[PDB]
């Protein structure tokens, strides 16, 4: 037969709105991009993705939160010589610091006053401001080491809630509040006026509603505070004399987030009216007169912009923005109006939420804390498990023959026997307290009974017991970004597995002797791994979009000519291939897929010859077929020797900025 | 049946006037629509019916005008795009042949009023 | 509708008096103006009902090509017994 294709649009797995973008390292234009730069994206359903902007923005890790959890602000902290530290507020009274290894909170510091509305990090990163609902600004001593947080000082109180914070330096702390005012406190310890609010400024109020100052930044090249409020106006204030220099009436509704570049020649700003405005001071006359101009204005987002940030280095100068529509947008910093931009896909499934089983023609898919199963026929939803004893979900696998499902999150996992009772299923928990106590990242089913478990604390069990696993050399990037030496992937069928950690290490393991035989042999982050039983091979693909294969018991000649005979589609690819499998009718052809395309490479053929992180910066160290007509893509797989399963996505009020009518 | 005979004859290569005659033979409304729904392309049925309705814009048969109005109802996404060199003057002379009835509908309705008045007063004065 | 039955009978019966009157149009101007403005727009609503009826029977015949299919097409469902076997806290309970 020819390939018959099930273009499924059943799964309505929808992410949530980006509420906070942050960059791990600050800008430093005249030095190279550090190998430890990570962008962090806190959504509104409570999960924190961490992306690396090397070679078109791959996604390294994801830290999910559970039911009724959100995340409103998040800040990085990297004292030079120590590990990265990631703090985040939710809609609650605590700050939550996460250890990047496990993907769990390692500290929930309850701030001692009210519900936190904003968070900011000191310059030199030893103190932390949390601005709370009862008008307080609380200082948290951060420099005690990673994990230990102390209370320092509650600054002088006020009535209205402080909605945004910024620091001048180690010295002063600026805060925009919900009464339309902008206070300036002094956090300079061992002064006479420590903690008391030195100044108050009032923005031009709205006529028929209350005004809220939503975004405040400090501009260090000049000595100003930029501030966006809920009238749309953007004001620049001289810090000394605490007074306005110039006001622009830029947006039509609120200005939720605004940011600046390194040398403060530009200020970018955005809000609910979904345009991004650029205010420039680049002319020598502008710099000697201290006069910003409203330079430009772009309409790129669909609904809102709730978060904006900027990075600028020797081989990277981009501002990143995201909002109520769930996608990310990258623009250039010094070439905003002129240059190009890239709207990311709303999901790139580096961690999958859908898998199928060929027997019973069935497919399982898990959104937040519920799984669902349907069969092909049309299609019919046969069962679902809205387990609400759970709070957060993570990865899942089904037994071949479709008997037992296992769902698993970083706190526990749970296994359910299934029996098809006709037009429905019957699902029963089968108790195992070892599974109920273990942390699981990946479960991948050696047999109908045996599974292999990768724990969040780097343990590899075999249940239904222990694989010896050698240690990795801890270099500076491994001590800086503390999840690089963590097992991302493991793929197995028939007693032979292979694990993969993102330092460029991909290690096989025989399930019998439980010995490594390492084949690290790599240069950067590994996107996907698939084992070919034909050729006795492992197939790794890295973030640079190269396909390597190696043998087992280094790379084959097919790899050796394929890598540099690779097609132009792969050489101009933008979305990384997150899934590989092999064809079912032929044991040697392999069939892979990214988030916007589907390809298939042939095992023997070779074809003839004749807005990124682009610098000389290193990685994290110091017949051929191609189609894209199923581009909003979530997951693909096979069922039998002729058909294919292509499950994708399909689609909210927004500020109407109308197209010209004719 | 005879609709299939007319379909095969009009689809083979030739006999278009005889094809419209065989269409006028059985001449169902449902089969008239079905013969438009079945065929995928026409051999300038619009051209031959254009010249027929141009040479007789006043015929008592409703067959070819019924066929033209159902062709224009069901296939006019493609009659404006099949051909535009002879078809342009075809629709031009068809429209100019048919506009005169729009010019003289008021006088015919006037004469209909005349005659209804005359016949009703003649029925009225009927000599007891 | 109802009253012009009266006006056609007045012309038919009194067909001599108001042909012997010297200024017919000047004496019943309001009838002439009313009928002129009623019958002046007849080509316009001719074009209107041609264009309207064309689309009307166009969707009528296209929907009569499949008019029996929407009588048993709706096979929709709801939160069935999978929800009862789904509630894992209620599965520990009952």
């Amino acid at each position: 037969e020819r390939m018959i294709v099930h273009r499924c649009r059943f799964v309505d797995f929808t992410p949530a709105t980006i509420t906070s973008l942050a960059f791990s390292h600050k800008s430093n234009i005249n030095k190279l991009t550090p190998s430890d730069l990570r962008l962090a994206i806190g959504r509104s359903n409570g999960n924190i993705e961490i992306w690396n902007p090397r070679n078109n923005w791959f996604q390294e890790m994801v830290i999910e939160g559970g039911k009724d959890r959100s995340i409103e602000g998040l800040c990085w902290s990297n004292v030079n010589g120590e590990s990265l530290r990631l703090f985040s507020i939710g809609g609650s009274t605590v700050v939550t610091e996460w250890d990047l290894a496990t993907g769990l909170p390692l500290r929930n510091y309850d701030c001692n006053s009210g519900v936190i509305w904003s968070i900011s990090i000191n310059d030199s990163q030893d103190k932390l401001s949390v601005g709370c609902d009862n008008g307080t600004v609380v200082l948290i001593d951060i420099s005690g080491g990673p994990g230990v947080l102390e209370h320092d000082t509650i600054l002088m109180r006020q009535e209205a809630r402080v909605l945004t914070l910024a620091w001048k330096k180690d010295d002063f702390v600026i805060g925009g509040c919900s009464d339309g005012r902008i206070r300036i406190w002094s956090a300079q310890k061992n002064d006479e006026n420590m903690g008391r609010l030195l100044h108050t400024m009032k923005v031009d109020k709205a006529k028929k509603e209350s005004t809220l100052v939503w975004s405040v930044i400090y501009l260090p090249r000049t000595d100003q505070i930029a501030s966006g409020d809920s009238t749309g106006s953007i004001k620049f204030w001289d810090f000394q004399f605490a007074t306005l220099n110039q006001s622009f009436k830029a947006h039509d509704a609120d200005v939720l987030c605004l940011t600046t570049d390194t040398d403060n020649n530009y200020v970018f700003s955005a809000g609910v009216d979904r345009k991004i405005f650029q205010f420039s001071q680049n002319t020598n006359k502008s710099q000697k007169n201290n006069r910003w101009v409203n330079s430009s204005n772009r309409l790129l987002h669909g609904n809102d912009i709730r978060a904006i940030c900027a990075y600028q280095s020797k081989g990277a100068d981009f501002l990143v923005s995201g909002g109520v529509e769930k996608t990310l947008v990258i623009n250039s910093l010094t070439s905003f109006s002129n240059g190009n931009y890239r709207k990311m896909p709303t999901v790139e499934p580096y961690s999958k939420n859908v898998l199928v089983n060929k027997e019973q023609r069935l497919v399982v898919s898990w959104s937040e804390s519920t799984v669902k199963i349907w069969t092909m026929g049309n299609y019919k939803l046969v069962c679902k498990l809205t387990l609400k004893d759970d709070q957060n979900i993570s990865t899942c696998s089904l037994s071949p023959d479709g008997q037992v499902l296992v769902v698993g999150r970083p706190s526990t996992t749970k296994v359910f026997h299934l029996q098809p009772v006709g037009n429905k299923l019957k699902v029963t928990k089968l108790d195992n307290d070892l599974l109920l106590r273990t942390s699981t990242k990946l479960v991948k089913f050696i047999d109908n009974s045996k599974i292999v478990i990768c724990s969040c604390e780097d343990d590899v069990f075999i249940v239904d017991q222990e694989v010896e696993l050698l240690e990795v050399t801890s270099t500076k990037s491994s001590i800086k970004v503390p999840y690089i030496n963590r097992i991302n992937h493991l793929e197995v069928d028939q007693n032979i597995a292979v694990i993969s950690r993102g330092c460029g290490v991909v290690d096989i393991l025989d399930l019998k002797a439980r010995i490594s035989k390492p084949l690290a042999r790599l240069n950067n982050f590994i996107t996907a791994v698939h084992i070919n039983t034909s050729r006795k091979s492992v197939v790794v693909i890295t973030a640079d979009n190269k396909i390597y294969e190696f043998n087992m018991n280094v790379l084959t000649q097919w790899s050796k000519n394929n890598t540099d005979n690779l097609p132009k589609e792969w050489k101009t690819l933008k979305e990384n291939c997150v899934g590989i499998f092999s064809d079912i009718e032929n044991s040697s052809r392999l069939w892979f897929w990214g988030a916007t395309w589907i390809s298939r490479i042939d095992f023997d053929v070779d074809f003839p010859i004749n807005l990124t992180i682009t610098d000389e910066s290193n990685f994290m160290n110091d017949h051929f077929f191609f189609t894209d007509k199923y581009k909003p893509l979530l997951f693909v797989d096979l069922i039998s020797s002729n058909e294919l399963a292509i499950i994708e996505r399909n689609p909210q009020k927004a500020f109407i900025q109308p197209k010209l009518v004719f | 049946n005879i609709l299939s005979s007319h379909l095969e004859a009009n689809s083979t290569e030739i006999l278009d006037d005889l094809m419209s005659g065989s269409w006028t033979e059985p001449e169902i409304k449902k089969f008239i629509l079905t013969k438009i729904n079945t065929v995928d392309h026409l051999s300038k049925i619009f051209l031959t019916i254009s010249k027929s309705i141009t040479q007789n814009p006043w015929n008592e048969e409703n067959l070819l005008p019924l066929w033209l109005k159902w062709l224009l109802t069901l296939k006019s996404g493609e009659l404006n795009s099949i051909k535009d060199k002879h078809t342009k003057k075809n629709c031009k002379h068809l429209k100019s042949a048919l506009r005169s009835s729009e010019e003289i509908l008021p006088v015919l309705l006037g004469i209909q009023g005349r005659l209804e008045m005359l016949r009703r007063q003649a029925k009225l004065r009927e000599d007891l | 509708g109802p009253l012009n039955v009266w006006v056609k009978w007045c012309l038919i019966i009194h067909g001599g008096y108001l042909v012997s009157i010297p200024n017919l149009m000047s004496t019943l101007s309001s009838l002439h103006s009313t009928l002129k403005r009623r019958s002046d727009l007849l080509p316009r609503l001719l074009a209107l009902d041609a264009r309207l009826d064309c689309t009307i029977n166009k969707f009528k015949t296209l929907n009569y090509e499949a008019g029996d299919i929407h009588s048993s097409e709706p096979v929709v469902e709801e939160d069935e017994d999978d929800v009862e076997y789904n509630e894992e806290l209620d599965d520990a309970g009952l």
Binding site: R2, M3, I4, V5, H6, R7, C8, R9, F10, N378, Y379, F625, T627, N650 | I53, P57, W58, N59, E60, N62, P65, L68, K69, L72, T73, C91, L94, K95, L98, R99, S101, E102, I104, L105, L108, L109, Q112 | L46, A47, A50, R51, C54
Partner: peptide, 28 residues
């Protein structure tokens, strides 16, 4: 009958999306 034919050829002169699941094919 003259008004009837005048009316019909005046009519003639004035007369002159994605589902949730598909199944298709592609190249081998």
């Amino acid at each position: 009958k003259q008004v009837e034919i005048a009316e019909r050829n005046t009519e003639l002169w004035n007369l002159i999306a994605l589902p949730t699941y598909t199944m298709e094919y592609l190249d081998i």
